[PDB]
Ligand binder design. Structure first.
Ligand SMILES: Nc1ncnc2c1ncn2[C@@H]1O[C@H](CSCC[C@H](N)C(=O)O)[C@@H](O)[C@H]1O
Length: 380
């Protein structure tokens, strides 16, 4: 392999334990998609890494030690990550959760999720996609009892990977409650598992006897959790037509009567106007948009999140709760808070809680940017 000399800033990252190689720190770089050995300014060995374009990064540190990347290396990787997750395997209440999370498990560019009897792999750059044989071979040694597996490409977008086929749609269990999911359709699966603990809080009664508005609902997974926790009623608003059948499916799977659960297909900015005109108000408002969305407005979470808080407050009950969630990697905790304060203006409010990624979505403790989920619960 090539020995690569790194500048002082690149060095400073490595020695504090950051695995991510950012392009800013490697402006010199005319090499790609390969494993390298990194050296300092004065010819000292810094570690083995690989190079591949991934958003703002050029690669990842693999080990501070001199190592060979091959299948036996991945077997070790997956033995360690499996061993952190023993409790997931012993409790029967949750059958869908994350097995492997990039640098959270010491190998950036790969995630792996379990969904009942099937697994899902996601490739975040062209190098890991090039070596999938050895990644998949190692995983199937360490986890031989899955019936089949699927893949997402994150860098044709989705494909069956090995073993049996899954049904187009099927039920998994999370917190003792059923959700309808699907593995071979676009980039999403019917649920973001990383919100497992926010859903659990709702099932446990955090919205009992209360009315809930759920904005950018997707498949209404937050609404079904609230309903199972005794919520008096829920309203789930999403721009996309597909939200109807995909939401109905969780409610039928839990034998829930939908008399007081309404599904709405509508732009969230139109919903705010419609709700004000009809004097609708809700005890709890859950806000969880995508990080960037396209086309009667363009939505960017960095710039426009203040708008959602501002307009939600107009339709919140006295002593109401806002649950403000984002999965954007590019917005820090402090930037997210700043958007929220901008939305509140002068209005008194209290931050009751901050929730971030659960332990299966493991994080590199040295890199704060890895913890990309932020969920604030705010009391008005
Ligand atoms: N202006 C808008 N109004 C309503 N929904 C929108 C929108 N822009 C994007 N969306 C929707 O936002 C969703 C992003 S996925 C959001 C995940 C969801 N909070 C959950 O709990 O599972 C997509 O379903 C898309 O249809």
């Amino acid at each position: 392999m090539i020995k690569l000399m790194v500048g002082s800033f690149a060095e400073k990252k490595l020695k504090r334990g950051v695995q991510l190689l950012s392009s800013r720190d490697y402006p010199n770089l005319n090499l790609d998609n390969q494993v390298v050995q990194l050296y300092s300014d004065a010819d000292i060995f810094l570690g083995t890494a690989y190079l591949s374009k991934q958003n703002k990064g050029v690669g990842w540190l693999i080990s501070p030690k001199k190592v060979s990347l091959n299948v036996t290396y991945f077997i070790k990787l997956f033995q360690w990550s499996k061993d952190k997750r023993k409790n997931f395997a012993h409790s029967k209440l949750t059958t869908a959760y994350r097995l492997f999370n990039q640098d959270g498990d010491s190998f950036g560019g790969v995630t792996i999720d379990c969904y009942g009897d099937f697994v899902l792999f996601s490739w975040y750059n062209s190098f890991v996609y090039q070596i999938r044989d050895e990644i998949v071979a190692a995983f199937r040694q360490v986890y031989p009892n899955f019936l089949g597996a699927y893949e997402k490409i994150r860098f044709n977008v989705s494909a069956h990977l090995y073993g049996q086929e899954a049904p187009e749609q099927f039920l998994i269990l999370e917190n003792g409650i059923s959700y309808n999911v699907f593995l071979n359709d676009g980039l999403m699966t019917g649920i973001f598992l990383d919100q497992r603990q926010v859903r659990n809080e709702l099932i446990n009664g955090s919205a009992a006897g209360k009315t809930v508005l759920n904005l950018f609902s997707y498949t209404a997974a937050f609404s079904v959790a609230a309903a199972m926790g005794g919520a008096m009623a829920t309203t789930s608003v999403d721009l996309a037509k597909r939200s109807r059948a995909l939401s109905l499916a969780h409610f039928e799977a839990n034998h829930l009567d939908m008399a007081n659960h309404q599904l709405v297909v509508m732009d969230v900015f139109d919903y705010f106007k419609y709700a004000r005109r009809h004097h609708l108000t809700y005890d709890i408002i859950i806000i969880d948009p995508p990080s960037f969305a396209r086309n009667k407005e363009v939505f960017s979470v960095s710039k426009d999140y203040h708008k959602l808080i501002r307009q939600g407050l107009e339709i919140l009950s006295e002593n109401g709760l806002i649950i403000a969630s984002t999965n954007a990697a590019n917005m820090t905790v402090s930037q997210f808070k700043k958007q929220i304060e901008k939305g509140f203006g002068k209005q008194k409010h209290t931050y009751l809680d901050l929730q971030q990624l659960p332990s299966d979505f493991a994080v590199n403790v040295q890199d704060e940017s890895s913890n990309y989920l932020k969920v604030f619960t705010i009391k008005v």
